[model samples]
Target chain A: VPTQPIPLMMNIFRDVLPTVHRYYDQWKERAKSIPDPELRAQALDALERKEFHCEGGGIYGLLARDRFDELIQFIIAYQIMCDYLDNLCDQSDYLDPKDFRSLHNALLAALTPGEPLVNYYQYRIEQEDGGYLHELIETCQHILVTFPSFRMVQENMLELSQLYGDLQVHKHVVKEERIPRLEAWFNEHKEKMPEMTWFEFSACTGSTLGVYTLATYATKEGLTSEQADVIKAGYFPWVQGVHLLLDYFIDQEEDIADDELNFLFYYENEEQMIERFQYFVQKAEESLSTLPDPKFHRHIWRGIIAIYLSDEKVQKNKELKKKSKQMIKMGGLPSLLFYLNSWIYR
Target chain B: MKVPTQPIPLMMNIFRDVLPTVHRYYDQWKERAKSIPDPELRAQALDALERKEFHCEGGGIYGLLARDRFDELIQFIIAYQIMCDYLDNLCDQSDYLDPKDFRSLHNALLAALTPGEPLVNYYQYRIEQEDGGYLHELIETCQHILVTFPSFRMVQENMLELSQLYGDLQVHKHVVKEERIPRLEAWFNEHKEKMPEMTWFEFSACTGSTLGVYTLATYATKEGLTSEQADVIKAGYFPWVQGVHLLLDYFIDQEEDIADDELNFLFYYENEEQMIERFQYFVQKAEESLSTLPDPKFHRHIWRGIIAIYLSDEKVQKNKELKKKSKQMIKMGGLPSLLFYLNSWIYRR
Candidate 1:
């Protein structure tokens, strides 16, 4: 297994990225067969526009060592479900809470291996996914049930999944209700975090990295429940926070122009935003020290920052470009190398 | 199509007939709520029954439309109202504020309105689940009546639509206090254009009443009930008649709701003059809609009775602004309202 940035980046570029595309290509073929016109259109659109979400999450498959292919299968399916449902929530005409809540149950259902497929479209107008949603859910269940340490990690996974589901429901409602609902929802969970704003806490819940972190460790043959708890604690508020804030940071100009809900806008100024980003990157580095493979987790942490900051969107906004340079310098030589390589990967 | 020409016949039907039936059904639920297994669930069940007993009593008055079949209709109304109040209590008192759980709990109301609707686990999202079938029995009581109604199909869709709005109101009202306004505002704005012009809280107050469902369900018991009549009754009772019912209820509770920090529709009214203006608007509109129904006098009497009964309360009588404003609103209903307003004091005393 690759323990350092050089081999890890090489492995990801040579094997992991290619394998993810193969799975996405297969799912795209199936997505094209969705019976409902609207459902089929959004399903295919999600795959085309959001393949990178699957790519980022799919890198976690490497942490499984020998079970690489199985974990990759699970990651792509889960991420595709996430991306597709997000498009459905954001773009659909029906904005009913029951419809949103019912749709998000798929997130919870995927983590639960034995639960039967639900009528996810019961409250929705456009129902038919031609079994696409159910198939993705089943793909996740097939691998999760076989993981030796799934029982050990299941609780953490469900907790993360629940928060993610709650975020989707709260944020995608009527535009007027989103900020207040998120603020109140954040109030309920803020006590669990280390003094972050409501938007930051919301940003923390937005990441699927914590889920992948636990799923990766669950693949280990004899992973203990205590270690699983430790992994979740290490990754959740800090590492996942870094993962999401970096995304929001890179998309700042676009999100601001669109008046989208971005966490970076919640910061007081550009300097404070940069300071907070640096703080999270350092905190994420500190948190991974207790995990099993500290070096690999650190590189994964730095790679998240490198890949996102390397995006051309960051270069388009002059101030963001400067901010990006400072953030990248904080990641040091390894991240610079990873950052340089991301251009090729892109 | 029989209309009550005088208030005496309506009063007799309510007191000698419907009141006794309501008492019997309510007593049984009180006994069941007391026997619940979980202490918190039991307390909430019994507390709602004790504090909000008037909700069942007021809603049950619609049972007179069943005429001889008022027995089952009153039973359904009482059971349905009790379920609403009990669920409201659990949401307000419980430690959890999850909107998903609140939404799930409210499926009970929808299933109660549809005869063959299968029951789901209403307590699936709730932490304390052992209610000893308290909620289930209430739902079954409603279903048992709906299953046999002759013209249920005529009213099913309308009843479901009203109940769905009612369910939305309960869910929005009971979420964390911080989220309550934004959710209610957004929800109101979504449907605002389709509804009559009213403030957000006014729209919410209109949905808070189950009078539309009560009226439609009672009319559904008639073998001669037509789809056109069901549509007219829904339009008549919804924002106008139910508005009069809920607005008067909120007007009386202005002091209480403010002290308790509950959602009082009256708080949104700019002043007493505006409150009186809106009250007159609802009363006049309620009468206009009732004029189109078969027994206009029967509904007219009920509408007048609602204004009289709520204004006759000791709470409303004690407040200076309400005491003065109540006279103006009661006068909008004419002589029938004046006499009923006078007679209400006798029963209340």
Candidate 2:
């Protein structure tokens, strides 16, 4: 269990690192071009407030490092689609769930290169995001259409986006019903999964990691299509689950304060939570161990626990603080060393 | 590294510490039931708890006892299963049709293992019939018991999948739209691609029971399992073992669901031969999955034994369809009766 941490993939994986500040550089470039003058500035302003959360998430760097120019472009563009849709969902007053489901069509459609990108704003108060949303969609479409290799893992990318779209629709449209509706939604898929909670499934499934995991391999040469899929299966549901849980885990205080859904609240206690964490670290380690260059995924998994556990928020909360300390202790030399190393890696 | 098959050691060990906990809970519940103020609803609550205990006594209680983690495992088993059965009764008879209410009601099940979550508001219909905290008691008992184990969550993560599916079945079984069938079919098709292939009905078979969750709690009684092991445990009972488990249950219930105008998955089998082949296929699937876990024969023996015990029931004999009986009975594949012989020791009935 006390294996050395691979150099942080998020830092080192970027062969041609993405330089765009998504919200700063492009948030309003398209928004300013919207025909509807009344709503155009509103779209620009709304998007400008957004920080590019996609980069903070490790997937964007994962894309950059994989050496796939087309995927790197497609993922960045698709990530904007995610952010823009999320801005809409942040408003709890939306009326039509049909529209919620429809709005997310871009989520699924983005991965399928040739699909028509419909106007997604029929239910939105603002009919235009300058050209922000459409530009993102078009960017996604252009690369996917051009990247012939993208066809290889298109099906997996679709499966992941479907869950992302479903959660956004159910969750943001009808807030109280979000968790249960997801439980019902997830119940539909759980038997097929090895072992995952509705929250874990939703959190993991909503992540682009599965798509990214599959696509990363597809971008590389020499692996059989079958091998790419085996690698995809290993990361998903377990590693992807742990990654999302940590994302949610870091936001616990703020989410609770806002009454927003927090996934860690679904865990029993720090003890169980720690086991669940270790379980994933080990699962992800095992999964990545067989991949061509295992250490990249391995470092990503170890870095997540080390970094999240070492976060300021965890330090302030006594239960989390104690549990984090214990897990770091039990995590032995690797986790202990990584605690110091995460600062260097990040 | 292999866990040996546990023999019939825990059969009589069912309530060593469990009933004392239950007695304390039931005493509190009985008092609450008495104070329900409405004698009729109170009787309903009281009788409900009393009848549910029969299920626990003959059920996973022994499995937990076998692992010697009797006290808390029994508490958790009774709570989760009884909550499931109790919620099913509420949802089935009520016509609320609102998915929100059903989702909130089952949120109790979702967060059963999570300690700080407030009890989800389970009362959708009757403000008057709320059991004086018995449901809350059942939920909290499960939570406290849950937080105790190191692998507490590896078990819960597996258990949650089965319970989550059951929650969806509860939500959908009552749905009336023509759209639902196709929608569910699409979802099933998507998931079936990821899991071991079986008939659509058999896939649905995995979604509707407490036994899978019970097997999960049974696993929790041991030192703990890896997430990988839990996956194997989940696959064993659901769609395959539980698929086999409940299909046999329906085999005995042919007249029952038919009387209710319900569709039994077994009936979907084209003919007796196909039904025999599918059951053997399910048993084969279960056996293959069991070998991946620590105690293959121990788990393997339970399935064969279950086939005999379920087959010997007067309900099965009373079916009066020899062709169907033979098709279902070959699941044993000519195995002898350690089942018949062990009945005296294992069963309370």
Candidate 3:
């Protein structure tokens, strides 16, 4: 157990940020093609809008942006998982027959990421607020548990739980737990972190939430049963953590761009971020060690690691930091692990 | 009815001349692209080469080009028929059905513009050159006698005689004429020309042979039918007149294209040179007569008249002269009927 969560967060960020930036490139291109200048202006304005209003409605407020970012992260994660699974299936010929079984087990592990936390959230919301949050979470949990290898299972479960909880929570508000049990477990079990202040953690968490939400929804529909199940297992949790890492990485740039405080910028240097990321990958692998089949578990872990590290935003940020010459050296281990896990292990 | 006793010389040039002209426009574009001394021209040439050779082998040779054209035509016809049938069967209230059906028919017609034989030449060739020449002439006489509607029924005995001769020929060749007879009958009955001239009839008969040879080859080899059975059935029954008629239509512009001194060119236009140029006028009248019938039947008759007018180089030349139009006026019918006739009229005529 680690005292800080930054290492795990950084590792996930290194893996996934590049992909996020790539998507942003596409988005920016599309934005340029918007027919109406006014609409484009409005979109830019909404990015900075945080004021709550009564008459005109606080439609472009921070909460709305926050919600939007969450959805985007969910979509992105779902897409990466799908892509990873597809690549794995394509490269199955390079793997041994027993590797498929390992992959199946890894699939199971990936699907059930953060199950304890999810269960805790449901229980807390239901008992403390007299809301159907528990039922919602239970339904989501049931779906995830039932279709553990399903591609969209985790995101679907999360969404269903959120919707159900929100519907019930409106009628029965409860006292907030400043440090929820799930949060504490995350802190306790997190891989390792370099020295970082409290403000950095908040920013990282917020960024993670935003990224995770986006990654979860990026997946396309009508996947095979195996793909769907694997997606449910492998992608969502990794996405959530990776998103947090990406937030921290982007924190300094964001502060520079928007003139806002992002404490991760003050606490950790780029080298520290990279080091923390490496530790996170190792920890994630260790966490998954309980999985019975090494081949499947290792392959899935490698795939998740590859997805995180190969992300375009992470690559761009590395370049922006003038660490271009160091990228190959830095990325080699994660890349090698991915190949070994995908090919040799699973 | 008289059968020319003289053996018609095998004119391979007729085939050579007509087959390559189908892609005249494409060839011109290709040539122009190659000749221009510019980077754009070279680029265009490269692009054209790719476009032409994308799927089928299109190396600017006759046989290869013909095969490519035939494949395209076959695929287009099949697709058009499928689309037409699908639309017709959709049972939708929307007008998309009719529109699609019409489009299919248009596409079919376009495809059929590339000529193919009707599968009758195998037997026709044997009769024209072999000892069975007399028997072939006798069969023609029988057909002429049976041409009248009321008289045709009385020729039941002749029909049986023809069938028996065909059947015996089938046995001698180890073939099954009975099975092939129905298909042949269906094809001829469906595609019979309403305004066939002597030349048109000859050309049409030859075209049928081309089709028969191809069909026989297709059925015997590709389809894995009983080869001996197919051979006997295919023997002693060539429809050279019909083959000639169809080929004449395909090469309807040849006489106009070539100088008059060429015997091949002279052969088709001889009728226009000697006889009154009434075939064109007669075809127009026949076309009008065909239009009186309702829908499909009308279209079929129109097609027949058009085939007759178009098959003879003489008639085509006359048609061109009458209009003073540079292009020959070879009227074509709807695609469904053409496809139906192509598949149906395998042997009978």
Candidate 4:
């Protein structure tokens, strides 16, 4: 089941509407400040009307239309990113694997909003509580089946699987005496989980289903026992951090338009934004320390930190403030900081 | 040796010129009966002058000028014969052993018509009295050596050389059989009397030097023998027939201006004009037979007959009375038949 939609997500909507209004105000104010009166009047007129066009549509209409619009735009944006990644991969040179992993995670994070719908469909099947986990397993099986052609997916899956394996080894080292007990627990739970298969679902939901399938499968079957341990150690901290950062940057505008309560919109300036972003990075880093294999731990930690540093809203807000002096230019800063606060709590 | 002054080979000129003049001569006689002071007479007068205009320029100029002014007006009486030969060749798709060979012959024929000194200058380097046979060999060699592409030249040379090798095998078979070797003897005899290269003599007589070069390189070189053979061939056949055909056609024209004797001026004509026109068809057929391969005895016999037939001036004199009646048109432009004869002989053989 998806997480509960918090009240703050709706509060963020109120904050976004006012910020958008303020941006219009600044546009008009700046147009009026121009030296030539006629040119200034023309500029002012265009800004006045452009604002009215957005306002006339009303907040609910704008949110509904813009949310879907953003959804489609982001899909295209990631497709462009995929093409760029493909070109980079083909050139026989490596980017920092950490940078590549963050990009991969960013793309994965973009797909999360669609997951609740996927899970709802998968769960409606006539099977046990964990029966849908079999669908997840089959999704991985499909990836394994089709992995030869999709190199980016194959490489990321292998990286994930290796992390899981290392974690299992680390668990054994730390709780060497409890090894037999852990094995017994795994055997008892194995039948309660779904088994992986091909032809169970379509390729659209394949990767998301694969991850859940592998997680439950590892817990139940004790497959890739060491790697599964390492993955669990690193996966939560990295994914949560990604979810938070994305919520802060990407979901802020949409959440505000939906009148959701978002904390990132409250940050005063760059220092506050960076300080909040760094806190998330540190939290992710601490979660990284639990893994057994030092190298795998460090690799996952590097990716989480990279995403925390590249918060998209902070980047956009910095560009906005540098280019304009009007009051409305500062309005986005508050909403963006308020959204950042939600990630601070996470 | 200089390139010859008469750029076109003489035999070809004879073939090109002889045709339409014969047709126009008949046209003149038909128009002579039309009554004056009538609309039809006025129209005939206008057309006769137009025919004379074409005659002055020559009939072969049809290909040179706009397609609209072509001598299609004569098609009912004369063009059918010419078109029949053309269509037959097209349908058969007969590939010339050397396509460039005909074009080279055409260019050599054209070069022969230039002023003397420049003509000699062009042919000077290739001239050799003792190795005069080399001139013919040079033309063949050039087909192999120069081409639009190396591959095209290579393919043509390979085909021609292989064909020649097969021909030599027949020669060998004849030699072993101990048969009467008249063909071989005749070829050898002809080679022995080959003309000295024109460059071997000083520029003492302009006409002889020019004629020698023209006769040898432009005419004989193309026909595959010597200057003397070319002279013999031209004298025995093409020139005289062509000359007589032109003279007779011009004399037959009445009041029509000789200068403007195009097909339009020829107006309407009847049977005798059509018959004279048929001689051109005969000559073109004869020339085509000479161009064929496998070196048969009948080829030589037919060629000899065509030469004899053309050189006979009695037939020419008999048609001279028609020429006298058409004297006004003749002086203006000679006859349409004369121009056609020149065009036919120049272009065909």
Candidate 5:
């Protein structure tokens, strides 16, 4: 049986958070020696903000626990790479969609491990993160060497990264062009996919679940490529989909405020919104059953709903509130159950 | 229960990090509201979020009690205060009536008390608006501070216990069945009777406000509160003195509640005359309680709060309908009572 989340969480804070913080701090401290002043300064400033990227990659460590510190470090590095790219491309004022896509090419190359490092600095305002980018890539590569079964699953990992990188590319596209670009992106994938909207599909694609799942499965003894394939199957559309959608669901407010395309906008009406959540919650719930034991996977499914919905941002939304009331009545029972489990947080 | 003595400006300044973003946050939330595909529901979305820009400002209770670790404590309390407001507006007060909504929205309060954990489903349904990321930012901000600051979390255990019951009351009150009322009554009485002074309704109100939790957080961050002392503040906020804080608010809002057909904590009271005596008893107890805190004189700020908001109703002497409530006249004497007590306090010092 899964232990109480509070005790687990208390242990994480007491144990894991510190270790995660230490490695990242060491990463930051080492980056300070980077000869590039501008990149060094930015890296230092960013340090004041986040401990590591949950960016949702941290969930891997939380799920796998201390079985392998190196795996956790690898997962953190991978997310750190995502964060660095996000900062350079989507997050900041850098709006060159073309440039953002090009920079993401390095992401493709990085996954191959032995590929020559690209000049991602081409699009960024400044190039000097003082070899921090190099370090991150190296860390990602070394992570695989330490856990080689990841190589077998690398193809699935690449596909997910491509989908995620595509999301970043299209999402960061010019405001006027967003709908059309996203529409095209979704149309190409929609026919082959499960029941999800373009934004929902994009949300699924945006997850690090593929990488994290592989890392997690690798941690288990006697894991195989076929099991890795099964893990991929279980997580991708439903588990990964729920996890990603809930993230966007939580961001409904922030994304809307930025005049951004929201998955919520695609729902059209309250009933659709309710149905979508029910479908995902149920689907995500069922998706977990295929995995071994899946106690943690179940937590992720419910925990995603719990954490995303727990935010006060959505609390004040009237239309969302009224519709959300209906969904919670029908499908949000795990929310209340997660009340005690609230300790295991994002 | 007494209101704080600090000015709104000072409180805002102290919580400066939390204040200036109020408009930006509202604008973002407003942006989300405008995006609903249905023009009609979009309008409803706009209406619900209307003037919700109370970000970064503290008045009423927060102003007076905020004296130490002002920035950090306000971050925690303001997030909480926002949670309280949003709950009242979106969950309970609005037309969208569902019990799940109550538990879901109120979950923010539960999460605020239990930091480091993921903030679970606060929106019962799909959220239609944005908060410029202010909502989770505030939630996580409080947790980060509590985890970072040993003192803040020290006081949180007590606040958590109180909040858990407060949450129960939030969900349980909607049970209109007669059998449920007795079960609810026992639940309330179990906690209320131990630190008696107020009726079940009054006790519920006392627990409803986050002022005590805010005050308790302030003390923990202020550098001198022991767990016992933290418990003292919690005790005041919980059963005994907290009632005075709420009853004063009740006395002023009686007319408003009657007009709205809403349930005021004062409804269960026997009569206007007994109401004053009960209210006054809490005031006395609060005074006695505050004097024993880390700073005895600091209790004066809390006392000033009672007098300030107690008499805040502009037309207390003139409003036609309000003046008719003879019971209110007992509370109407609040200004006089404040001055007398203030004079005694000055003389005693």
Candidate 6:
């Protein structure tokens, strides 16, 4: 069900990241012509600083091996849009929630396939971007339109993005208001959602990995809504939490300096932080056991830990350095092997 | 026209762009304080948020110069300033007089600007074992910024120089009151020769303001910032711009510092006459130093803005001596000074 770690690593380095970079280069070249200087700068800055997100998310396109080109294109466009919009919101001068929400409409619009696009910048001052956002939206729609079971996953995809959009809005609001807004928003869904802190729920929404997982599976013929639900359950709260928790773990210092909301701060201590991380990873592994390609999903889960823990940032933070080893141990040999692989490549 | 002293645009950036970010940091830190284990330490952390927020707001004004990287720069400024305020509260308000605790606590500041440093247990020597990683987060935030900073090499030495002096002063001044002057003067004596002609107290005052660190960090946000420019900024800010800023702070808090029985550098002045002359000397030197830098007008406005805003305080008006001295300072600051003075009032409005 899964390629060995060696082959998988080879595929990623040989086939995946470079392909993602090619698409990225094309967009980077086109983005140079973006009309507004401010918009252009942010667009370029996102591509440069957050290329890793596209590269990481692009790994999902391997699931649609039959239509890898189209899937990779969609993945790149969608992830790039996420990164660019995140940059816009984080680096933004505007505090208006409406502005953030309107900008995020492009994200939902991209996933809706046949839907007409709205003016995504209506609520903001810097308007012109030379159809850059339009191009990305169209690229995503073009690929999804070809998926046989698009309708089955479209609702799930839209739901994931909606949560993502809401988190972006609430998290980037005036810092004082962010926690209250996020907690209130989380409470609305807590009845049905997993038990987690408001910050952890916020972290769940912050990731695009779920959407990627769902979309890649939708590419298969005769996909079932049941299968979609299984994939969603496997990735949504636990898998995505593991993804984002590790992110927040390595980035705690960075986020602290930036005054950005980091879910990791909600833990009572490093021990609790480690306990929750282990819990998320175990739950993620258990959830993956029922998936179609259980081994591949498991491999991905382990790799997520390996990739994040192997970060240069881990070396700078001693707590992170020690905790990373413990988490890698939990991930077992596959994670340990991948950790070595990631560190070597890095 | 060359250096129009009107501060309306500057105030707009500071108020609209800068202050909201500062508020966000305190909001986050206030929430983070919930995890602080010790009641006294936790209360002081929260109190620092309420009382010393202006320090963050004031320091964040430098982020306007970061241009496109204003977001990152403001984050560094706010994190750095919050660390300063928080550590000051820990040492001054708490009953602990152990310089080891204070020095250990203030190392968070040094570590913040140092980038890639090991996470030292800053409270290891103190009774407060857990701040829920509040201090570490602050340090890490600063390190994260500095590590990726474009011209960090140019600013690193200067930034650490300022941070170390700041840490030293925090430790020396916040130690037991009997040892305060002796320790401060000794620390100052070592660096006084390297400083411009000033008393030990004035030299200590110069190390007190974080404006130099903010200025250097913000300028480093410039993609093409040069070592020469960094040196000029460090030159202009330390012992002069920073001196003027801290002295004005001490000047305004004359009544508060006295009532609190704290050491105010202004107390070391010979009298009102000598204080005025020294204040003027610092202002004159501050203005002249910036004359050679890029965007001379903005830098001049900052110096003048510092004078106008600090002098316009309600405390100055309430005290007759401070009131008379405030007039002379405002007169020296000229029309631009008057503009920011009124603009400062409007900001409150």
lDDT of 6 by residue, B86-121 (tens): 888888885769999998888888788787789978
Chain B TM-score for all candidates, comma-separated: 0.91, 0.78, 0.24, 0.20, 0.72, 0.91
Model 2 spans with C-alpha error above 4 angstroms = A1-346, B1-54, B61-68, B95-97, B125-129, B176-183, B221-225, B322-349
DockQ of candidates 1 onward, in order? 0.00, 0.00, 0.01, 0.00, 0.01, 0.01
| DockQ-based class of model 1 | incorrect
Worst 10 residues of 3 chain A by lDDT: A51-60
Candidate 5 per-residue lDDT, tens place, A1-346, comes to 2345644444444445555665676776776786776666556665555443442355556656545467767777777677667666645566787688876776676667787886777776677665777777787776665564666777877887888889888887678888788889999989889867777787778777666777766665566778877888778877777666666666777886786777667778767776887787677777777787578666655655655665555555666556566654424333332332332231
- Candidate 2 backbone collisions, by pair: A13-A65, A30-A131, A31-A129, A31-A130, A31-A131, B237-B242
- Which has the greatest lDDT? 1
Cα-based TM-score, every candidate: 0.48, 0.43, 0.23, 0.18, 0.48, 0.48
TM-score of 1: 0.48
User: Which candidate model has the greater TM-score, 1 or 2?
Assistant: 1
**Residue A172 of model 1, lDDT score:** 85
The regions of model 5 sitting more than 4 angstroms off are A31-47, A50-52, A62-67, A91-94, A220-222, A253-257, A328-346, B1-349
What TM-score would you give candidate 6 relative to the actual structure?
0.48
Instruction: Summarize candidate 1's per-residue lDDT along A1-346 as a digit string, tens digits.
Output: 6886445655675567778878989999999999999999999999988887877787887777688888988889999999999988998686777888888899888989999998898997789888999999999998898999988999999999999889899888888888898999988888877988988888788888888888888888898888888999888888888788877877777777888888678789878877887887788778899888788777777766766765657644677777777865743333333333442243
| lDDT preference between candidates 2 and 6, better one | 6
DockQ score for model 1, please?
Answer: 0.00
Q: Chain A TM-scores, one per candidate?
A: 0.91, 0.79, 0.31, 0.27, 0.84, 0.92
Candidate 2: DockQ?
Answer: 0.00
Report the error of model 1 at residue A46, Å.
89
Task: Give the worst 10-residue stretch by lDDT in candidate 2 chain B.
Answer: B7-16
- At residue B155, give the lDDT of candidate 2: 75
lDDT of 5 at A209: 68
CA lDDT, candidate 2, residue A8? 35
